[PDB]
Design a protein around this ligand. Structure first.
Ligand SMILES: [Zn+2]
Ligand SMILES: [Zn+2]
Ligand SMILES: [Zn+2]
Ligand SMILES: [Zn+2]
Ligand SMILES: [Zn+2]
Ligand SMILES: [Zn+2]
Ligand SMILES: [Zn+2]
Ligand SMILES: [Zn+2]
Lengths: 132, 125
């Protein structure tokens, strides 16, 4: 049957589908030699000229050995959907990256945030205020 | 905040972390060249060739760890634990069914999975 997924549990699941370079949910997730995964755009940037080292474990990698890791993108989609299936007859703007409702504004980044955004490493030290 | 994961949604997430070879949740998940992933054991034994899902060629030296998949398994098992009896070893959910073909005790995820859903099952007593 169904189960309640706590806030803490959802945070951990998001963590697993989050790029270590940009700290957003993975977009076109790919893995390098060592098996660590990244957004394809992100690791392509780090490896400009053909290669570099893994930002997590410092093992060497080549851009030609990029591998698609589609299950991670599927898992992002499953997590975004939990937010839309949520609403007990309810509808409004949703975070482009998490699919949760937007109720906060990051003054540093000058954009709206959901609660997942607010707690994440990417924003949790920024100044935030409620939307109005 | 919190959200209800429906049974349908849970099922879908389980499907993503299930090995196409043994039809259980990944144990030591690893990828081959096409990007398809498998338990290390399961794909190793296919080598001892061609991708069971899509048929693209692969080589065993090119296996890569895909640890996110294992971490997700662990996350999904905790969901059941945090809503809390005897528990499925692969899914963490409560056992209430018994498979007459395999002779083992099943959780609701087992029962609806490709692996046992065609098997004769009965309630535990
Ligand atoms: Zn990224
Ligand atoms: Zn690495
Ligand atoms: Zn967000
Ligand atoms: Zn911010
Ligand atoms: Zn397997
Ligand atoms: Zn394949
Ligand atoms: Zn089970
Ligand atoms: Zn069975």
């Amino acid at each position: 049957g169904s189960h309640m997924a706590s806030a803490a549990r959802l945070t951990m699941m998001w963590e697993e589908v989050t790029c270590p370079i940009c700290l957003d949910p993975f977009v076109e997730p790919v893995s390098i030699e060592c098996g660590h995964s990244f957004c394809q755009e992100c690791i392509s940037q780090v490896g400009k000229g053909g290669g570099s080292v893994c930002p997590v474990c410092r093992q060497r990698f080549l851009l030609k050995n990029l591998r698609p890791n589609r299950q991670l993108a599927n898992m992002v989609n499953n997590l975004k959907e939990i937010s839309q299936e949520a609403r007990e007859g309810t509808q409004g703007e949703r975070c482009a990256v998490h699919g949760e409702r937007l109720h906060l504004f990051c003054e540093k980044d000058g954009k709206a945030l959901c609660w997942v955004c607010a707690q994440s490493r990417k924003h949790r030290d920024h100044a935030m205020v409620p939307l109005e």
